[PDB]
Amino acid sequence: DQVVQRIDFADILPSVCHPIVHDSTIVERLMKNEPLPTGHRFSQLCQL
Amino acid sequence: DITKLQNVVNEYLKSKGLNKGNFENMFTNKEKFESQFSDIHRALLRLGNSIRWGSNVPIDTPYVNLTAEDSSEIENNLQDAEKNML
Secondary structure (H helix, E strand, C coil), rough: CCCCCCCHHHHHHHHCCCCHCCHHHHHHHHHCCCCCCCCHHHHCCCCC | HHHHHHHHHHHHHHHHHHCHHHHHHHHHHHHHCHHHHHHCCCCCCHHHHHHHHEEEEEEECCCCCCCCCHHHHHHHHHHHHHHCCC
């Protein structure tokens, strides 16, 4: 029904402030086991 | 003679066969560029392939080459040059 309903960052907190967002473990594992870039990006990106 | 050897041998072997070391061929193109200090850095890494072809099942060996007395005489010649560049 035509009720004005409002959403905020204070309302979004219980889904954005969870520790599984702020973990790095799964991102580290997946970006590790993902295959490496190619040669012509590899000269540009993986050098430092 | 460094340009003739590095051009003719290194790039053309790694292009004619074993097409994986073209990143190292870009490195040896920058070695052909006049950045000698950084160029001679990782001469170990571009020596390891010569170790792989001089002796089968590649190991790490000493940096100077295969013959022992020639290996010592190279270092004697390099000390002679370092004392007298002229």
